[PDB]
Design an enzyme around this catalytic site. Structure first.
Site, mmCIF file in Angstrom:
data_model
loop_
_atom_site.group_PDB
_atom_site.id
_atom_site.type_symbol
_atom_site.label_atom_id
_atom_site.label_comp_id
_atom_site.label_asym_id
_atom_site.label_seq_id
_atom_site.Cartn_x
_atom_site.Cartn_y
_atom_site.Cartn_z
ATOM 1 N N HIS A 636 0.819 -1.202 0.000
ATOM 2 C CA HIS A 636 0.000 0.000 0.000
ATOM 3 C C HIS A 636 0.857 1.257 0.000
ATOM 4 O O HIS A 636 0.473 2.282 -0.575
ATOM 5 C CB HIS A 636 -0.915 -0.030 1.224
ATOM 6 N N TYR A 678 -11.780 2.450 1.696
ATOM 7 C CA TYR A 678 -10.662 3.249 2.187
ATOM 8 C C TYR A 678 -10.175 4.224 1.126
ATOM 9 O O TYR A 678 -9.832 5.371 1.438
ATOM 10 C CB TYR A 678 -9.517 2.341 2.634
HETATM 11 ZN ZN ZN Z 1 -8.365 5.614 3.007
#
Ligand code: ZN
Ligand code: CA
Ligand code: CA
Ligand code: CA
Ligand code: CA
Lengths: 723, 523, 523, 114
Positions: A636, A678
C-alpha cells in the site's frame, strides 16, 4: 604408566575397610545418600503440602499410616510394568489430602540402580500427582512433549515411557485427554523424572527419547524453583512475609519523601483530565463560531471518544479549512499523561510533536521522577524476587489482539495464533513505566497476558502503599519462556523475563539491522555502504518487529515483478530513502517533522510516505482500519512510492505525483466507485488501493480489480511501462 | 564417578544387575537392562563378575566379548561372558595301510570317534573288518616285522582357534604299548584351525604318516605279537596333549587382531579347568561336545562374586536349548529323552540339593538347581546303548524296527529305503536269508564279514545291494511265493574275529528282524 | 571436540549420514553429502562404519581408501570403503614333459581357476590329448618310475599386491595322492606381483620345475599306477596355500610407500573371510572372479554398525554393473541372462527374505534383498553348461548353431567364419563326415586325437582346416546328392581315451552339427 | 618430534570439513575476505568521493552502471600487460565524476594470488 603395586593400591582402596559402624548407622546413612540426589525443592514442597517422610524397617504394610489400605491397593506395578505386592515391595506412597512417603531401609541403595530407581519413581509420582496438581499441571507444554514423543520416526520412546493404553490411541493428544486421563500423564511424567534423576540411566534417557531429556533438564534447572514460588503464591502468609520484607527495606525512601514527590507519584498514577470551561473560555472569538457549527459525525480524523467529547463541548457553548482547527484542537484535550508521552516518544522527549511548555513540563517532571528513583534493590533480606504484571495484548499488537482468544468460548487461546505469537517473541524493551505488583492479583477482562519479572541486582525502583511497585525507564528484558497456563478454568499466557542493560538489546538490533541491509542489498544490487533499512524500536514487542521485517519484504518481493522493485528502489536510494520498520508513533522517527509545516498537521496511521525525503514508515502494534496484515500495508505504501516515481517521469521540473495530473482524475471519477471504502476519500488512496489489490496473495482478489475497473487495470499496467 | 574395580570397561552395578549392548543409529551403546524395551528387540541380558577382567578365566575380556571386539573365529555361543572359550583338538584317522617291512599289503578304511571314559582328550579308531586273515595276505613269519601307514586329520570341536601350532600325538596299541609318536613337521605351518573345522580341510589332501615326499621321519614298525593283538582287537587309540601355542588378541588403535607372543594357551587352560562346570552333550548327531560354564565356588571370595547359574540357564547359554511353550527342548527333542550321568562328588551335591527342595524329579526343578564350580555332568540320549567310552554302540529293538518303516523302491536287485542318519551309526551290517514256506532258512552271505551290503547314495538315502555277494547276479526267485528275509545287526552284537572254534558262519550273531515281504509286486 | 571413535580420521556424522570426496581448485576436499550439488557432478555417495578403523577389515583405512593415500597397485574397485582388498593367487601351468627315470612326451596344458560346490585356491590342469599310447611311447615296463617336469607361472587375480613372498603350492594327482610340493626359490625374489599380473610376466621365461641351472631341486617322480591314472584321467590339481608376506603401507610424512615389517597378510585374511559376503562372477571373460563386500552380521554388536548393503548396490560397487535406462546390465549384457547360485544357508535366508516381501521372482526385487555377512553367491551365465568345478564346459546345440550361423566360406577345402571368443572356450575341435541318403556315414578322421584342426588366426577368425589330417589332401564327393556334414565337438562330449574295447571310432561322440548342407553348391 | 598420526591430524585439519553453507554464503564471505586486506582508509575515501562497491554475479558488462561503455573501452590489459576482454575479465572500474567498483564474485579469491 601404571605399575602393578599401584593396581594393588587401587584395588585395596576399593576393598579394604577400617571402621564398621554396626548395622543401623549405615542403614540411616544409606537413606540419606538415597535422598541426596533429589532436588531440595520438591522435598520443601512436599514439606509444604503436608507430607511425612517415613524411613521404616521390615514390612511397609505393617506401618500405622498404611494400615487402612484395602486389599485392592496392595497390587503395585513397578517402573518396568511388572507385578509386585506391597509386603514384597519396599516403597509405597499414600494418596489424598495427607500424603505419606514410606521407604524400607537397607544397605542396597548405595550401589544398586534398581531400588534407588524405584524410590525416585515414587517421588516423581508424588510430584506429578500431588504438588503439580494444585496449580493445574502438567499442561500444554508437556502435551507438546508427548505428541513429539509419539510422532517420532523411531519407536523406542513409546516403549520406554508409555503404557499399552497410550500406544493404541489412534489420534494425537488433546487437552480433553489430559482432563479425563490425567493419571496416565502423571505416570509418564513420573517415569521421565525417575530416568532423569538416577545418574546411571541419564544417558539412556537422553539416547532413547531426547525430547523428554530436554524437557526434564530445563525443568529441573528453572521451572522447579519457579513452581515452588508459584506454589507459595497460593498461600497467603508467604505473600505477606514478602510484603513485610519489601516494606521494611523500602521504608527509608518513603521516609525521605516530600509533598512534591507524592504529588508526582499520584499524577504518574492517573492521567490529569482536562476540564471543559477552560477549553470553551480559551476560544471566545470566531473560533467559538467555528466550533459551534461543525459536522461532528463526519470527519474521520478523530476517534469515537473525541467526537463524543466535542459533542459534550457543543452543549458547553466539513472537510475544508475548519478541520485544521480540529487538527489543532486534537492535542488540546488530551490528558497530561507521562506514560502516554513516554510510550509514544520512544526515548526522545525532545520530539516537538506537542505544545511548548507542555513539553518542558513533561521533561522536568520526567527528570524529577527519574531523580527520585535512585534506590537500588541489592539487599540481604531475601533471595530471588518474583514480581508480576497483568497487561493487555493490545498494548503490544492489534494484529493478534482480536484473534488471540477463540470465538466459541472466550476462556481458550487459539493455538495457531498462539504459535504465531510464540514464534519470535524473544525479548522486550521497557521504555515506559512498568507499574508492577508485589503479589498476585487477578486480572481485568481484557488482560490475559500474565507477566512475571525476575529482577537484576541493579534494579532501581520506588514503593507505593496500595500494593504496587514502579520500574524506571529504558529497561531491557530477555524473554525466557512463553507458555499457556490454566487458572480457575480460564486459559491464559504466562511470560517470564530477565533484566538486562539496554546496550545488549540495542547491540542485537544493530546486528540484525546490518544483516538485513546486507541481505537486501545483495538481493537488489546496490552500493556496499547504503543504509536502506533501519529500526527505531524501543517497545515491548521489539523482537517480533525485528523478525517480521523479513516476511514483509519477502512478500513485497514475491507480489511484484523484480523490475519495478529495482527501479523504484534505485530512485529511493537516490532520494535518501529508508524503510523504517518501527513500533513507535509516526511523527517521532524524525523523517517526518523535518519536512512538514505545522505541528498539528502530523499523521499517525499504518504506512506513510514522506514526499520530500522519500521515506516509507510502518507502525508495529497498530492495525489498519482496512488492511488484513502488514504486507499489504507495505504494498500500500509502495503504491505511493510508484506514484511519486511516475510523477517524476512526466517532467523533471514539475508536479510530484501522476495522480495530480488531470489525465487520471477522469478515470478516478469513472472507475473510482467499484472498490473498497478506504480509497474513496480522494484519488491517491484509490491509487494505492488499486496497487495493493492488483498484487494479492490469492488471485481472486487480483481478479476483482480485473472485473470492476478494467480501464484502470490497463492504465496501471501502462504505468509500469515507465522503466 | 562410577566405580570400576576390575578395569575391564564395564561398571559394577551393570555387571551385577544385567547389561546389554544396544545399537541406535549405527553406534554401539552399553546400557542398563531396561526390560520393557529390550525384550521386544531380542537383545540378551548379560551378567558377569565385578572383580574379574574375564569371568570364565579365558583370555578374552568381558567388554570384548559382549561388544564383538574379539577374534572372529570364536564360536557364537562363546560370545557370552559366562561361557569359556578354549580349544579342544583330537585326531581323526581316515584310513590305514599295513605292509611288510622289506601284493602282501592291506588297505582298509577306518572310522574314528572321540571318547570320554568314566582333562586330556583322545580318540578311538575302529578299523573296518569286512572284506575288500591278515597274516595270509601279508605273508608274515615269526621273524617278521610290519610297517604301518595311515592318513590323519586334526579336528577341532572347541570354541577357539589355534594359530600355527599343532599338538603332539601318541599312538597307543591295546593299553600302553606305544607304537609311535606323531609330531607336526617344521613346527610352524602358517595354518588356521577354526572351531568345527579340519586341518587340512576336507577339500585338500590328508596328512600322511611318512609321506611320499619326505623320508627322514621315523618309520612306524611292529613286532609279531603287536600284529597279533592288532588283528585281535581291530582297535588303535590316539592320545593328544595340550600344547596349543599363542593367542590372537585385539588392538584398539586400528582394529587389528594379531598373534601376541606374550600370551599363551598353556598357562590359561589350568584356570578354566579350575573355575568352571563342565557339561558334555551328544544330542546333536551322537558325537560328544564339551563346554564349560562359569559357576560359583562357595569357599573362595573372588569366586563367589560370579553370577548364579541355574542348570536351565546353563543349558540355554551353552547348547542352544530354548523353551517355545514352557517345555525346554532342543530342536523339538524334549529333555525327557535325555539322561543325566554325574560323577561322584557332584552326584552327592545334586542329591543334597534335591533333598533340600523336597523334590524327587530332576526334570521338573531345573530352574532351581544351582551349579557350583568343578562339576562334571554328562547328558546322553535315552534311546541308545553306550559302551565303556560313551559311544553309541547299541539300541533297543523298537526304534531299530521303526527306522525301516518307510519304503521307497523295493525290488529283487536290492532295497532302497529312507533311513535316519542317527540310526545308521549304531548299525554295523545286515544279514540276508531265504525262507521257504516249509521252514528252511538259507543265509546268502554265510560269513561274519560279508555284512557290508548297505551303501549310502549322495542324494541322502541308502541302497541295500543283493547282488553284492551273489556273484553280481540279481536275486533268484524261482517260486515267488516264498520270501527273502533281509535284516540287521547292531555294533554291540557284531563279531570282529573268527571264533575260537574257527566258525566263520553267521550263526551266533544276534539279529533284529526288519523286513519280510512276499516277493511279487509289493516286493 | 569433534566425535571420532575409530581413529581413522573421518568424523562420525559424516560416516553414518553420507560423505563424498571432491577436488576443487586442485585440492582434495572432503565434505558432507548434499544432493542437489553433488548429484550433478557425478560423485559417489560413500558410507562406512563409525567404530571400525577399516570397514571391510583389510589393512587400508577408510580415509586412505577414499582419498587416494594408498599403495597405488590396489585395484580401482577396492577404493570404495566396503570392498575388501586382498590377494588371490593360483598357479598357471603352461606345458608338461614326462620323462623316464626321443622317448619323452611333451604336451601343452590349459589350466583354470576352479570353485567347487573358502580356504586355499585350487586349479585344475587339463592335459592335451591330441597327436604330438604313452607307455609304449616312453617304453615303460612294470617296475619303472617316471619323472615329471613342467613350467608354471604364478598369477594374481585379487585386488591387492604381494611383496617378495610367493605361496607354497602342492601338486595333487587324482583325488588325494600328493605328488610333490612346489616351494619358492631363493626364499626372496625382490619382485612385485600386482593385481591381474603374472609372475614371471608374459614376455619372459616361465619358472621351470627342476630347472637347468638349479640341481638341488628334488626330482618329481611317479610309480606305475600313478602313471596309468595320469594317462587315463588327463588331469592334475594344484592346491595353493595363503602365505602372502608383508603389506605395503603409506607414510604420511613424505608420501613414501614401503614394505612394512610389522604388518602381515596372514593376520588380516581370517577377518575378511569372517565379516564379508562373497560374490563370485564370470560374465566378463568366463573366469571365476572372486570379490568380497562388507556386510552386517546381526548377532554381533560391532557388526550391526556397518552400512546396510543391498544386492543391487553390491553388484554396482564390486563388478561395475550399471543401469543406463533402468535395466541393470553389464556392458550391454542384461542380468536376465545370468543365474544366481547359492549355498544352503544363504538359500534359506534368501527364501525367508522373499517370503517376507511377497515376491517370487528374484530378478525384480534386487534392491530389496539385504545381504548379511558369511553369505556366498555365485552368478553364472545362462547360455552355458557347467561341470562340478564351475568351468564353462558346454552349451546347448541351438546357441552353437546360431553362433556359427554367420558362415563366411564353405567348400571342399575347409571352412572359414567368424567365431566369438566365448564360444571358442568350449569347443575341442571339428570333424567332417559324409552321410549317404540310404544311411551310410563316412567320418574322414576317425580317431579321438585328430580333432585339433582349428587354429587361432591373426585375423581373429578361426579356419576349420580340412587338409591337415586327410593325408594333406582335400575332400572329393562322388555324388552331390548325399550330404556333407561337419560338426564341432563340445568339451563335455569330448572323449580323451579309447574305451575298454580299444575303440577309436566316432560312435559315442554325441554330435552337434554346425553344418547342414546337401554337399553341393550350397556347401 | 612428530609421529605419523600427528601428520594424520594435520592433514585432516586441512582436508576434512563439517559444515557446507551452500554456494552464496561462501560467495559473500570470499568477497569480504578479499576486501579485508585493504586499509580501511581508502575504502572510506572511496565512500567520501562518491563511489559504489558492487559485488555482482555473472558478466560485468551486463550490469547497469557499465551499460553505456563503448566498444573501445572493453579492451583491458591486466597487471602483467597482456590482453583481456571485459566479458572475459572480472573486475572493471568506471572513471569520472561517479566511480563504480564492479567485482565478479566467486570462491577463487580465498586461495589464489592472481
Ligand atoms: Zn483511506
Ligand atoms: Ca567391571
Ligand atoms: Ca567384569
Ligand atoms: Ca570415523
Ligand atoms: Ca570409519
Amino acid at each position: 604408566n601404571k605399575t602393578q603395586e599401584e593396581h594393588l593400591k587401587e584395588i585395596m582402596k576399593h576393598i579394604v575397610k577400617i571402621e564398621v559402624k554396626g548395622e543401623e548407622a549405615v542403614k540411616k546413612e544409606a537413606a540419606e545418600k538415597l535422598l541426596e540426589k533429589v532436588p531440595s525443592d520438591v522435598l520443601e514442597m512436599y514439606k509444604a503440602i503436608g507430607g511425612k517422610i517415613y524411613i521404616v524397617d521390615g514390612d511397609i504394610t505393617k506401618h500405622i499410616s498404611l494400615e487402612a489400605l484395602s486389599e485392592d491397593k496392595k497390587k503395585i506395578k513397578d517402573i518396568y510394568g511388572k507385578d509386585a505386592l506391597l509386603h514384597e515391595h519396599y516403597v509405597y506412597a499414600k494418596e489424598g489430602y495427607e500424603p505419606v512417603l514410606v521407604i524400607q531401609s537397607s544397605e542396597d541403595y548405595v550401589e544398586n540402580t534398581e531400588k534407588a530407581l524405584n524410590v525416585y519413581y515414587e517421588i516423581g509420582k508424588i510430584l506429578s500427582r500431588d504438588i503439580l496438581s494444585k496449580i493445574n499441571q502438567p499442561y500444554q507444554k508437556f502435551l507438546d512433549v508427548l505428541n513429539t514423543i509419539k510422532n517420532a520416526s523411531d519407536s523406542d520412546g513409546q516403549d520406554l515411557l508409555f503404557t499399552n493404553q497410550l500406544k493404541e490411541h489412534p489420534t494425537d493428544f488433546s487437552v480433553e485427554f489430559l482432563e479425563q486421563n490425567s493419571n496416565e500423564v502423571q505416570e509418564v511424567f513420573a517415569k521421565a523424572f525417575a530416568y532423569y534423576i538416577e545418574p546411571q540411566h541419564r544417558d539412556v534417557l537422553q539416547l532413547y527419547a531426547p525430547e523428554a531429556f530436554n524437557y526434564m533438564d530445563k525443568f529441573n534447572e528453572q521451572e522447579i524453583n519457579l513452581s515452588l514460588e508459584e506454589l507459595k503464591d497460593q498461600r497467603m502468609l508467604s505473600r505477606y512475609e514478602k510484603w513485610e520484607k519489601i516494606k521494611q527495606h523500602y521504608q527509608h525512601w518513603s521516609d525521605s519523601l516530600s509533598e512534591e514527590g507524592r504529588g508526582l507519584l499520584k499524577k504518574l498514577q492517573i492521567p490529569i483530565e482536562p476540564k471543559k470551561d477552560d477549553i470553551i473560555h480559551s476560544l471566545s472569538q470566531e473560533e467559538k463560531e467555528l466550533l459551534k457549527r461543525i459536522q461532528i459525525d463526519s470527519s474521520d480524523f478523530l476517534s469515537t471518544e473525541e467526537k463524543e467529547f466535542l459533542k459534550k463541548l457543543q452543549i458547553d457553548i466539513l472537510s475544508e479549512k475548519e478541520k485544521e482547527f480540529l487538527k489543532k484542537l486534537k492535542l488540546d484535550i488530551q490528558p497530561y499523561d507521562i506514560n502516554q508521552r513516554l510510550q509514544d516518544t520512544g526515548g526522545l522527549i525532545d520530539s516537538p510533536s506537542i505544545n511548548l511548555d507542555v513539553r518542558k513540563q513533561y521533561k522536568r517532571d520526567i527528570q524529577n521522577i527519574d531523580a527520585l528513583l535512585h534506590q537500588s534493590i541489592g539487599s540481604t533480606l531475601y533471595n530471588k524476587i518474583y514480581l508480576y504484571e497483568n497487561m493487555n495484548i493490545n498494548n503490544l499488537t492489534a494484529t493478534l489482539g482480536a484473534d488471540l482468544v477463540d470465538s466459541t468460548d472466550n476462556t481458550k487461546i487459539n493455538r495457531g495464533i498462539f504459535n504465531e505469537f510464540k514464534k519470535n517473541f524473544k525479548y522486550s524493551i521497557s521504555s515506559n513505566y512498568m507499574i508492577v505488583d508485589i503479589n498476585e492479583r487477578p486480572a481485568l477482562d481484557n488482560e490475559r497476558l500474565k507477566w512475571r519479572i525476575q529482577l537484576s541486582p541493579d534494579t532501581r525502583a520506588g514503593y507505593l502503599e496500595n500494593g504496587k511497585l514502579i520500574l524506571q525507564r529504558n529497561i531491557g528484558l530477555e524473554i525466557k519462556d512463553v507458555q499457556i497456563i490454566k487458572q480457575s478454568e480460564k486459559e491464559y499466557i504466562r511470560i517470564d523475563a530477565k533484566v538486562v542493560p539496554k546496550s545488549k538489546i540495542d547491540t542485537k538490533i544493530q546486528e540484525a539491522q546490518l544483516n538485513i541491509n546486507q541481505e537486501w542489498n545483495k538481493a537488489l544490487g546496490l552500493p556496499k555502504y547504503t543504509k536502506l533499512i533501519t529500526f527505531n524500536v524501543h517497545n515491548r514487542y521489539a523482537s517480533n518487529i525485528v523478525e517480521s521485517a523479513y516476511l514483509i519484504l519477502n512478500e513485497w518481493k514475491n507480489n511484484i515483478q523484480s523490475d519495478l522493485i529495482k527501479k523504484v528502489t534505485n530512485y529511493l536510494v537516490d532520494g535518501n530513502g529508508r524503510f523504517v520498520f518501527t513500533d513507535i508513533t509516526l511523527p517521532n522517527i524524525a523523517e517526518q517533522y523535518t519536512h512538514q509545516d505545522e505541528i498539528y498537521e502530523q499523521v499517525h496511521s499504518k504506512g506513510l510516505y514522506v514526499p520530500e525525503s522519500r521515506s516509507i514508515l510502518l507502525h508495529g502494534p497498530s492495525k489498519g482500519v482496512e488492511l488484513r496484515n502488514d504486507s499489504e500495508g507495505f504494498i500500500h505504501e509502495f503504491g505511493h512510492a510508484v506514484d511519486d516515481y511516475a510523477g517524476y517521469l512526466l517532467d523533471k521540473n514539475q508536479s510530484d505525483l501522476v495522480t495530480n495530473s488531470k489525465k487520471f482524475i477522469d478515470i478516478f471519477k469513472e472507475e473510482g466507485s467499484n472498490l473498497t471504502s478506504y480509497g474513496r476519500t480522494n484519488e491517491a488512496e484509490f491509487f494505492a488501493e488499486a496497487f495493493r489489490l492488483m498484487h494479492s496473495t490469492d488471485h481472486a482478489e487480483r481478479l476483482k480489480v480485473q472485473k470492476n475497473a478494467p480501464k484502470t487495470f490497463q492504465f496501471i499496467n501502462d504505468q509500469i511501462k515507465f522503466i | 564417578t562410577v566405580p570400576d574395580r576390575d578395569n575391564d570397561g564395564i561398571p559394577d552395578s551393570l555387571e551385577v544387575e544385567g547389561y546389554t549392548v544396544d545399537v541406535k543409529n549405527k553406534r554401539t551403546f552399553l546400557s542398563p537392562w531396561i526390560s520393557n524395551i529390550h525384550e521386544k528387540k531380542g537383545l540378551t541380558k548379560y551378567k558377569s563378575s565385578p572383580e574379574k577382567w574375564s569371568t570364565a578365566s579365558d583370555p578374552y575380556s568381558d567388554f570384548e566379548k559382549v561388544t564383538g571386539r574379539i577374534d572372529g573365529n570364536v564360536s557364537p555361543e562363546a560370545n557370552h561372558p559366562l561361557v569359556a572359550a578354549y580349544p579342544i583338538v583330537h585326531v581323526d584317522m581316515e584310513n590305514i595301510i599295513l605292509s611288510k617291512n622289506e601284493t602282501r599289503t592291506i588297505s582298509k578304511n577306518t572310522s574314528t570317534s572321540r571318547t570320554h571314559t568314566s582333562n586330556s582328550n583322545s580318540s578311538t579308531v575302529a578299523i573296518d573288518h569286512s572284506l575288500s586273515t591278515w597274516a595270509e595276505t601279508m605273508g608274515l613269519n615269526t621273524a617278521d616285522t610290519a610297517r604301518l601307514n595311515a592318513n590323519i586329520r586334526y579336528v577341532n570341536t572347541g570354541t577357539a582357534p589355534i594359530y600355527n601350532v599343532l599338538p603332539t600325538t601318541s599312538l597307543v596299541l591295546g593299553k600302553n604299548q606305544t607304537l609311535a609318536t606323531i609330531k607336526a613337521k617344521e613346527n610352524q605351518l602358517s595354518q588356521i584351525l577354526a572351531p568345527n573345522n579340519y586341518y587340512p580341510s576336507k577339500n585338500l589332501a590328508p596328512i600322511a604318516l611318512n609321506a611320499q615326499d619326505d623320508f627322514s621321519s621315523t618309520p612306524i614298525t611292529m613286532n609279531y605279537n603287536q600284529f597279533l593283538e592288532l588283528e585281535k582287537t581291530k582297535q588303535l587309540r590316539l592320545d593328544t596333549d595340550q600344547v596349543y601355542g599363542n593367542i590372537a588378541t585385539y588392538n584398539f588403535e586400528n582394529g587389528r587382531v594379531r598373534v601376541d607372543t606374550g600370551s599363551n594357551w598353556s598357562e590359561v587352560l589350568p584356570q578354566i579347568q579350575e573355575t568352571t562346570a563342565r557339561i558334555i552333550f551328544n544330542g546333536k548327531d551322537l558325537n560328544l561336545v564339551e563346554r564349560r560354564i562359569a559357576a560359583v565356588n562357595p569357599s573362595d571370595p573372588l569366586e563367589t562374586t560370579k553370577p548364579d547359574m541355574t542348570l536351565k540357564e546353563a543349558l540355554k547359554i551353552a547348547f542352544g536349548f530354548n523353551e517355545p511353550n514352557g517345555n525346554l527342548q532342543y530342536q523339538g527333542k524334549d529333555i525327557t529323552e535325555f539322561d543325566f550321568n554325574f560323577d561322584q562328588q557332584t552326584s552327592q551335591n545334586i542329591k543334597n540339593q534335591l533333598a533340600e527342595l523336597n523334590a524327587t524329579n530332576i526334570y521338573t526343578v531345573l530352574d532351581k538347581i544351582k551349579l557350583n564350580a568343578k562339576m562334571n555332568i554328562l547328558i546322553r540320549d535315552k534311546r541308545f546303548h553306550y559302551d565303556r567310552n560313551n559311544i553309541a554302540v547299541g539300541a533297543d529293538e523298537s526304534v531299530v524296527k521303526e527306522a525301516h518303516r518307510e519304503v521307497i523302491n523295493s525290488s529283487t536287485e536290492g532295497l532302497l529305503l529312507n533311513i535316519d542318519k542317527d540310526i545308521r551309526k549304531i548299525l554295523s551290517g545286515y544279514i540276508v536269508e531265504i525262507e521257504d514256506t516249509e521252514g528252511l532258512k538259507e543265509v546268502i552271505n554265510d560269513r561274519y564279514d560279508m555284512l557290508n551290503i548297505s551303501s549310502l547314495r549322495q542324494d541322502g538315502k541308502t541302497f541295500i545291494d543283493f547282488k553284492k555277494y551273489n556273484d553280481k547276479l540279481p536275486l533268484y526267485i524261482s517260486n515267488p511265493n516264498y520270501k527273502v528275509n533281509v535284516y540287521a545287526v547292531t555294533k554291540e552284537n557284531t563279531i570282529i574275529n573268527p571264533s575260537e572254534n574257527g566258525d566263520t558262519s553267521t550263526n551266533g550273531i544276534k539279529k533284529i528282524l526288519i523286513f519280510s515281504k512276499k516277493g511279487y509286486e509289493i516286493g
